[PDB]
Structures are given as C-alpha cells and as structure tokens.
Structure 1
Amino acid sequence: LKDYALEKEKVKKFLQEFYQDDELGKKQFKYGNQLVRLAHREQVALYVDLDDVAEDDPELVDSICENARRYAKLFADAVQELLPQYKEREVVNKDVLDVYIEHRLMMEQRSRRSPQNQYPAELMRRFELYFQGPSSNKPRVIREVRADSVGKLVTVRGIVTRVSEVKPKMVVATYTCDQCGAETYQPIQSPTFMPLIMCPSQECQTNRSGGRLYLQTRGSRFIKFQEMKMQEHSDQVPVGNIPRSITVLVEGENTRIAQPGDHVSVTGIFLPILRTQGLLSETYLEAHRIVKMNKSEDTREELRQIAEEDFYEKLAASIAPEIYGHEDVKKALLLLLVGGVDQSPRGMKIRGNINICLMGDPGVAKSQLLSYIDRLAPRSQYTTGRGSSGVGLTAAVLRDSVSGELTLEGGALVLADQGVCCIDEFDKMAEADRTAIHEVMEQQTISIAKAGILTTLNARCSILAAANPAYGRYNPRRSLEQNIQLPAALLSRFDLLWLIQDRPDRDNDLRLAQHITYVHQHSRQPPSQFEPLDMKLMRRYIAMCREKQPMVPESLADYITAAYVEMRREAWASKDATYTSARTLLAILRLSTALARLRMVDVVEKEDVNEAIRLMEMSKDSL
C-alpha cells in the first residue's frame, strides 16, 4: 500500500550506487557490471541478494517478504527500464529473439500512453530475475508451510523424489493474421490457455471482418520449465509422522541443477494454481535459487575422555537397548553405521556399498531392529521390502488426472541416497526384483533398451538384507546347495551372511524375561551411570567425530598380508559347507575402514591387526 514510483526510484538508486570491496580488494560496481552484461546480452540470469538490500533498507526487505510477486515484477520492470541507457552499439544478434526484438523496436520507432498499443512487459525481456532468500529468515519445515504463508518468500529443505525432463514452456504466444499485417500478443500465465480466433487488430476492429489468425512459434518467447517433487528430510520428521511432498516448479537458468536424491535448498513465491463445491486450489513453489556450499572450495584432554575409550563399549551401549542381546551381531551394525562415506576421490564408489545379509526373520524377533536402524541413523531414509507393488521402483505410463506427462520417478535405492538401505521380506521379492539387487553388485552399469527404463540409478547407499527361512528352519543334516533351492552363487555375491540358530540355551533364555521389563519401566536406560542428556544431542555427538577425518596407516597392510596366507589354507582344507574366496580380500580392507579411524595415535599402529582379525573370527565358522 505505497506509491510505486517512489519504490521504483529507491530500487533504481540502490542498484546504481551500491558497491563492495570484496572483489580483490577493488571496488568493481557489483550490480553495475551485471547490468552492463544484461544490456549487452552477456548474462541471462540476474540474482538479487536481499542481504545487500538489508544493509541500508530493512523495511524494504520486510515489505518484499510480505509480498513477493508484486515486488518481483516491479524489479523486473525497473531492470528493463534501466537497460536501454547502457546500450552502446548494434545488437550482434545472439539468437532469433534478439533479431525479432530489434526489428520490433526499429519498426515502432519508424512510426514516430495508449493502453493497448504497447508490447507486453514480459515479451521484450531477454533477462530473468530472481531473489535469494535473506539470511534473516530461518529455514522452515515443509509441514509448517500452510495456507497462512501463501504469497510469502519462504525457504524449505528436502530431497528430490520426482523430476521430469527439461521442456519448453510458453510465456508470450505470437499471432499473425493475413489481413492485418501486425502482431497479436497473448501472455500466458496458467498452464492452460485458449488459442485465439478473431484477431484484435485495430484494422479489423473497423472492418469486423473474418480475421482468421494462425498461431506461430517464430517470435514467441520460450523459457525453460521443470516439475520436481520434494519430500521432507527424514532426520527432522517426527517418528509419529510421515514425510510430506510439496510441488516445486523451477524455470529459467535455475533448471538442470536438481538431481534425484539430492539435498537442495529452495526459495520462491508460494502461489496457488487453479485447474479451470467451493474455491479449490493447489500449491506450488516457484523456485528462485538452488544453493550449494561456498566454504567447501579449496579438543583438550582436561575436558572429556571420549576418543581414548573404544566406541565398541560406549557407542554400542546406548544404541538399540531393547534388543535382546546379540551384541556381537550388533557390532557389524556399527560398521554399517560408519559406512563408506569417507572415500578417496579416485572412483572407488564401492566403499559405501556394503551388501549385508541376514537369514531368519522369526529368530529372536530381530525383524524389529531393521526398522530401528533407519530411524536412528542420520542421512538415511525409511525403506520397505515389499510394501507396495512393482510400480514403486520402476517407471510406467498410465493415465493421469492432475498432471504428469511421462514423468520419471525413483525407487527404493534412490530413496536413500548414500545411506543405509533396508529391505525386508527378501523371499517374497520376485526374480525381477532379485536381479535388480544383483545389478547393483555389477557396479552400477544399468543400460536397458526397454522403452520404460533407460535410467542409471545412483546406488551409493548400503544395502541391508533380511532373509526369511524357506518354509522351515535350517536343517543341520542337510548342507547347502541341496536344502535351499536357490543357487548358492546368487547368495555368494553377498559379502556377509548371517544366520542365528535358536539353540535351547536355558541360561540365556532366563535373562530375556527380566530384561524385557526394564524398557519404559524406569528412566535409567543407559545403566552405566550415563547422564540422561537430551535425546537430540546424541546424534550431534556422532557428527563431530565424522568431521575429524583421520588417516589409516598404509604400512599396516603388509603385516596383515602375511596373516592372510595361513587363513586361506585352513579355510579351504576344511572342505565343509562354509568356504571363502578372493571376495574375502575386499572384506579385510573394508574392515580397516572403521577400525583404523577410531584410533587417533599416528605414531605406532599394532593392535589393529588383531582387531581386524577378531572381527573375522566371529564371522569365521558362523555356519
């Protein structure tokens, strides 16, 4: 509710005489160069950081936040009106649009304010304007964006779940008639528009003639367009909730940046869409900026005692306490919790691919812990084994009602990006699904000549497998390859196989009945006199440990190599059901990944050799 001339003047002054000295300690007219480039068609997108506006006009920033579309158009018009004074020469005819624009200006001037006798403001732009969210506005959670924030510049975070391919979208449609000789312009804002029939040319206004017009695509303005669906970060979604999906539309130079499964930050105007019992409308987000990191380009002993103590006794002791024991099995989960995120930049993407397998769901009710892994683990998303039909991972073409023209969707592997992937009910999966897992073992070489699938999935998560026993418990009398019908070679590809036989150990069984009561019975859950603490902080303690980035010892490899010679001979000479091969070599090197990082000594490394072995010993003879 203000005079727009004053605001246009204010933004004009703000753009003309603001600068900085960060550019090589030299004043370079930060916005001035961008304006010069725009006038010369040397730059397509113009970004206005609201932080600079706030440095001398906080009230303008608040006004912009309160209403985004109107100030956006005002800035666009101001930039358009400021460009012509910077023109220095004749257009070098970058593309057809510039050619048409220069002819239009030349012809209009050749005939040297009427409401309908001017070009629409969006037709003669050749520039795009966007706003970067001011740092003052804290990021908001998608669930908290409701109707009350419509029209407010907001910023939300999430993961890309459904992105279509780049296609052209039309801003101004060009119409020419065979009798008028002029140009008719119909700006298009809605996703649907009605082609014209009767030309509105002034000449035909007098004649009331037929005026049959033909749509053309020559001089029309086109801009890039995309459809992406974004879902809440799993780390902040409450356990008693599910993540929600909100639609985001990105246009212009801002496209071709999102990839499926990537964390993005989106800032835009929250606007409703009509689709031509009340007034119904949907919501979307017209993004303006998608932002990467900027800083990424290139501890006293008297306070705490954390790193000197083994994490196997400390980290394990406060993770998944309801589990009925089986701590030795839990140790591998600690390796799984570590993963292969810290990798050398040499193309070894298999470090994060840990295909762990467990056989037997009824065993000690370990089917419960599978869900617990996804929830507590950060940078990981909940996954289901057979929770839906086959359409949930692959892509097909069916009828649509709201939208979607041959759009592409991701699967479970894409759902958890570089994290922990949990699949349950392995037996219930069909052979086609079984091959899909097997394809990941082939180091992501997905090329398919079938019409519906031609994608290359970014399988960088860790695959956790739980296998039900096939219509009966393991048979001691029958060895493998005879009792189980599935070929062992398919299972052989798995690096680790685990099965638990429910032996009649009465002493151990005594513990569970007493142990099962304690959960939710008292407040002393970490019994080893650990301070209760805030539940949120427990995850944060893990993050600082990952940021240290220690170094494994290279010389340690040779000493372990000598040990391997004995290990091979005894394993083969047994000629029992359990057997190893060269695939063991991968496991050994993978073992040092979590083991050697924990010990921050950097002087002498000796214990790791026995520690690496001890992990194999439990794996050895596991039957």
Structure 2
Amino acid sequence: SDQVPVGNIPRSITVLVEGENTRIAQPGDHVSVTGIFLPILRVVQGLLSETYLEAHRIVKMNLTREELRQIAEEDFYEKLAASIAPEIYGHEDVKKALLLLLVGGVDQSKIRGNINICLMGDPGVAKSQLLSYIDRLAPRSQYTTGGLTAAVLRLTLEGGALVLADQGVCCIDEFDKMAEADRTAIHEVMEQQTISIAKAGILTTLNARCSILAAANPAYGRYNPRRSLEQNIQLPAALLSRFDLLWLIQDRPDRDNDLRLAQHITYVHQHSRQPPSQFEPLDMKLMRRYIAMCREKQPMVPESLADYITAAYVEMRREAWASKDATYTSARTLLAILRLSTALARLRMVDVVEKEDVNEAIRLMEMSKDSLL
C-alpha cells in the first residue's frame, strides 16, 4: 500500500514458485521476490501473451535536530493529535485515541499489542472520514464496509482484508451491517489474532494480527439516550466489550457548538483549507515517520507503577459497581489500560512508562465510558 498512488488501487502479479522456493510464502506476507519476468502463452499486429514472474529468491521482509526537539516538546503528542484529520473539527480525544491505535501496543514478553477501537455514532459525524484518514496514514492499511476474512477460491487460499492487514489497521465502516459469520470472524481476530476458515471441512488458521477500527450507526436512526447500549444498536454486547475503547459520538444540537462547526465548514468551503490553529498540522509523511520511530521503542512497566495502576483499577471498578448500569468493567479494562499506557510511553520515546502516561490512559478510558452517558 505504500507504493500505491493516492487515486489508484493495488495491482497484482502472478508468480510461479518452483523447487526449494516452494512453501516459503504465506498469504499476507510482505515479501520481496527476485525472478525473471517472462510471458506465458496459455493476434492484433502480433501475438498477445499473459505475463508472469519466474521466482528465484523469496525473502519475507518485516532526522534533523529540530525534529528531535519537537519530539521533546510536551505538547508534541497533542500536536500529533491535532494533525489527525485537521479538517475534522472537534473530536480531539477521539483523535488522540486514534493516534494511540496507530502507534499500537508493545507486546512485552507476549501481550496482544493491537488496540481495537470502535466508534458508534449518529449519521453525519465524520466517522467514515476519520476511518479513511487512518487508512491513508497507517503504513499498512485496509478499508472495508461488509471479503474481510480469508476464502478458498476454486483450490487456492485468498486472504481477505483482515489478512491483508497483518499488523496494519483494518478500518471497517458500517460495522453494524456486518454478517453474523463476519462478526464471529472478527471476534476470533480480536481474541487470538488468527482467522479460522473452512470451506471443505478443513479448519485452516491464518495469522491475522491487526488492529481493528470499527464504525457503527445506531439502528432506527439517531441514538436514543433513554435506551441502553445494544438497544439502539444491534451488535452483541460481548463483541463491544472486546474493544479496548468504545466511543459514542452524539450529534446533540447545541447552538454554540453547532455554530462553531458551521463556521469551520464555511471557512473550509471559502479557502479549501481548515481554519488556522495553534499548531499547523504535520504532513502525513512526517506523521508516518514519527509513528515508525515510536514503533522502535518497547517501553517497560516498572513494578513500582504497578501499585498505582492497581489502585486506579480497583477505584474505577468500585465506581462501576456503584453505577447502576454495568460499564463492561473487567480484566479486559486493566489490560487495555496497560496497552494504552505503553502506547503513550512509545509516543514519549521513553523505554519506561510514567505516571503521566497511566493518568492519561485512565482519562481516555473514563471519557469513553462517559461518552456512553
């Protein structure tokens, strides 16, 4: 996806592997092939033939000072959040969560490093645009609407979008309109990071380790606050509980906020650019570079911080029990807290998590649960 032009789609080349090179590649593998490009004749002004690539070697592949100074800035992270789709006014915390997803977990050993996020909201709140922007910014990206999972074409395995993610990010718009089988598949993806598929009674397991960014709309129109979750939406509650972060976006008519949004849109239409902000949004390439730099690190969690993390967890769980409506609190929540903290540590380029990161993760989690208010 890196080499694909912005306004085009990936192209395919058939490769004929033979000899010892066989059984050296799997679907979804980001590989490099050295071989001879030759035609296969399986007649306008000459013969016409289909081409292939006779493989010979297959190998599975895996700044300036001012840049570092900017990285050292405390607002640096916030700045990056502002750069996530600047034209999308508001949703700052949502953008921050998306950035955390983009930087991912650490998987210190192993821990599932993917940070699955879901955005449930009324129609017309920029969800699809956000998903598209993430697909454009994440180095390895897939976009889908609901195929997603692998298939057995007739006799060849064909990786679905989920497989093509393979440590990338799979942005699934219109999540609420996904087939039940697909729901089960994504459940398995979030549980083991593998896809099990069987067409002729053969359970084949493929490595699909990819963060999931889902978007959904409440059924029967806009979300009804008086109706509990899964009442305005038709998704299994457990599946939602799987996601590390679940954000509810409500298009509440607020004259002030609505006016602000209108002003923003008008400025865009009158200048083809978003209104000027405190920090100019960074170019996508630079964002990707910083993301990769963050992926370099694998910060640790000092045992001392454990005490505070446990305290926070017990506090929030007690609050949830005090809350009349169950807020999906469970060990999953603690795991997500840890993942978010380590992702923030990656953003800080510090191999040791800090109180700051834990507090920020807790704040994001609280804000999601409040968004369900």
In structure 1, how many angstroms separate the alpha carbons of the residues matched to 2:349 and 2:136? 29
Residues 453 and 321 of structure 1, relative CA distance in 2, 3 Å threshold: farther
In structure 1, how many angstroms separate the alpha carbons of the residues matched to 2:153 and 2:61? 39
Deviations 1:495-521 (A, max 9, x none): 332211211211011112221244486
3-state SS of paired residue (1:499):
strand
3-state SS of paired residue (1:617):
helix
CA contact (8 A) 1:413 1:457 kept: no
User: Would you tell me which structure has more helix in proportion to its own residues?
Assistant: 2
3-state SS of paired residue (1:245):
coil
**How many pairs align?**
369
Residues 362 and 477 of structure 1, relative CA distance in 2, 3 Å threshold: same
CA contact (8 A) 1:361 1:466 kept: no
CA contact (8 A) 1:250 1:288 kept: yes
Q: Offset of 1:466 from its aligned partner?
A: 0.9
CA contact (8 A) 1:260 1:414 kept: yes
Q: Offset of 1:319 from its aligned partner?
A: 2.4
Q: Offset of 1:274 from its aligned partner?
A: 0.4
In structure 2, how many angstroms separate the alpha carbons of the residues matched to 1:407 and 1:333? 35
Runs of at least 5 residues in structure 1 that lack an aligned partner in the other structure: 1-233, 385-391, 400-405
Q: Offset of 1:257 from its aligned partner?
A: 1.3
In structure 2, how many angstroms separate the alpha carbons of the residues matched to 1:395 and 1:380? 16
Q: Offset of 1:271 from its aligned partner?
A: 0.8
Deviations 1:198-241 (A, max 9, x none): xxxxxxxxxxxxxxxxxxxxxxxxxxxxxxxxxxxx11211111
Residues 516 and 378 of structure 1, relative CA distance in 2, 3 Å threshold: same
Q: Offset of 1:551 from its aligned partner?
A: 4.0
Q: Offset of 1:534 from its aligned partner?
A: 6.8
TM-score (norm 1): 0.53
Residues 411 and 506 of structure 1, relative CA distance in 2, 3 Å threshold: same
Q: Offset of 1:395 from its aligned partner?
A: 6.5
- Aligned residues: CA RMSD: 3.4
Percent identity (aligned) = 100
Deviations 1:126-179 (A, max 9, x none): xxxxxxxxxxxxxxxxxxxxxxxxxxxxxxxxxxxxxxxxxxxxxxxxxxxxxx
3-state SS of paired residue (1:246):
coil
In structure 1, how many angstroms separate the alpha carbons of the residues matched to 2:223 and 2:278? 41
CA contact (8 A) 1:383 1:422 kept: yes
From 315, 329, 341, the equivalent of 1:580 is: 329
3-state SS of paired residue (1:286):
strand
Runs of at least 5 residues in structure 2 that lack an aligned partner in the other structure: none
Q: Offset of 1:600 from its aligned partner?
A: 5.2
Mapping 1:65-144, distance limit 5 Å: none
Q: Offset of 1:259 from its aligned partner?
A: 1.6
| Structure 2 match to 1:466 | 215
Q: Higher relative contact order by CA 8 Å / sep ≥ 6: 1 or 2?
A: 2
Q: Offset of 1:248 from its aligned partner?
A: 1.1
CA contact (8 A) 1:353 1:462 kept: yes
3-state SS of paired residue (2:156):
coil
Residues 426 and 525 of structure 1, relative CA distance in 2, 3 Å threshold: closer
| Structure 1 match to 2:8 | 241
In structure 2, how many angstroms separate the alpha carbons of the residues matched to 1:318 and 1:598? 15
Residues 429 and 604 of structure 1, relative CA distance in 2, 3 Å threshold: closer
In structure 2, how many angstroms separate the alpha carbons of the residues matched to 1:477 and 1:534? 42
Mapping 1:54-73, distance limit 5 Å: none
Residues 271 and 551 of structure 1, relative CA distance in 2, 3 Å threshold: same
From 358, 361, 368, the equivalent of 2:119 is: 358
In structure 2, how many angstroms separate the alpha carbons of the residues matched to 1:603 and 1:496? 23
Structure 1, 309-318 or 485-494: larger mean CA deviation: 485-494
Structure 1, 504-513 or 613-622: larger mean CA deviation: 613-622
Residues 339 and 575 of structure 1, relative CA distance in 2, 3 Å threshold: same
Residues 424 and 350 of structure 1, relative CA distance in 2, 3 Å threshold: farther
Bigger radius of gyration among the two: 1
Q: Offset of 1:421 from its aligned partner?
A: 0.7
CA contact (8 A) 1:318 1:526 kept: no
In structure 2, how many angstroms separate the alpha carbons of the residues matched to 1:556 and 1:236? 42
Structure 1, 456-465 or 523-532: larger mean CA deviation: 523-532
Q: Offset of 1:522 from its aligned partner?
A: 5.2
User: Stretches of 4+ moved more than 6 A in 1?
Assistant: 299-303, 395-399, 523-526, 529-534, 601-604
In structure 1, how many angstroms separate the alpha carbons of the residues matched to 2:230 and 2:292? 44
Q: Offset of 1:333 from its aligned partner?
A: 0.2
Deviations 1:8-45 (A, max 9, x none): xxxxxxxxxxxxxxxxxxxxxxxxxxxxxxxxxxxxxx
In structure 2, how many angstroms separate the alpha carbons of the residues matched to 1:433 and 1:603? 38
In structure 1, how many angstroms separate the alpha carbons of the residues matched to 2:289 and 2:203? 39
CA contact (8 A) 1:307 1:598 kept: no
CA contact (8 A) 1:264 1:290 kept: yes
Q: Offset of 1:377 from its aligned partner?
A: 1.3
Q: Offset of 1:254 from its aligned partner?
A: 1.9
CA contact (8 A) 2:341 2:361 kept: yes
CA contact (8 A) 1:339 1:351 kept: no
In structure 2, how many angstroms separate the alpha carbons of the residues matched to 1:397 and 1:604? 44
Residues 526 and 489 of structure 1, relative CA distance in 2, 3 Å threshold: same
CA contact (8 A) 2:29 2:60 kept: no
- The reply to whether residue 502 of structure 1 matches residue 251 of structure 2 is yes
In structure 1, how many angstroms separate the alpha carbons of the residues matched to 2:248 and 2:281? 35
CA contact (8 A) 1:265 1:291 kept: yes
Deviations 1:82-141 (A, max 9, x none): xxxxxxxxxxxxxxxxxxxxxxxxxxxxxxxxxxxxxxxxxxxxxxxxxxxxxxxxxxxx
CA contact (8 A) 2:151 2:160 kept: no
Q: Offset of 1:393 from its aligned partner?
A: 4.8
In structure 2, how many angstroms separate the alpha carbons of the residues matched to 1:444 and 1:602? 25
| Structure 2 match to 1:457 | 206
